[PDB]
Symmetry: C2
Subunit: 95 residues, 2 copies
């Protein structure tokens, strides 16, 4: 962390907005997930993985940003981009 | 596959429903994620992996089922439950 991707075109991945619901409730949290990583791509080489939640692009937090805003961050990045990711699973400890 | 869990009355895992949206649209698909697996439980013993998605319960597909319906499939199950899972893998056939 972060994942550094060097491009010569594209980075080679797609992202999707998700909602994660708790139990049977209507309450959710909003995230951006790496949906697919093309094999042989800079993103694939760099170790970016499908299912990874993105928290930052080039150090900028994606919290509160809508899908198109995140895409825009990736597009203006140009040739090299840094992506901070976190596991998509429970990371907390109960006592 | 599938994961075979040998319970007694708790399997030892938590599930969440997630919505994955297409682009900037309001269209989504639903996925049932293994959110947490309790150490030292039947689910842990069975090798159920947090972060993976449930596709079948005792051979029955979960497409089109909401959270409470997936719960019911698990409750109606006996001591042993077979769960089919898949990781996030959205690789396309590109030529």
């Amino acid at each position: 962390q972060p994942i550094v991707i060097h491009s010569s075109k594209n980075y080679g991945f797609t992202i999707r907005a998700i909602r994660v619901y708790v139990g049977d409730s209507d309450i959710y949290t909003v995230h951006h997930i790496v949906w697919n990583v093309e094999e042989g791509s800079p993103a694939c080489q760099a170790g970016l993985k499908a299912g990874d939640l993105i928290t930052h692009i080039n150090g900028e937090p994606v919290h509160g940003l809508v899908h198109t805003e995140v895409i825009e961050l990736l597009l203006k990045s140009g040739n090299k981009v840094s992506i901070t990711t976190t596991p998509f699973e429970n990371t907390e400890t109960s006592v």
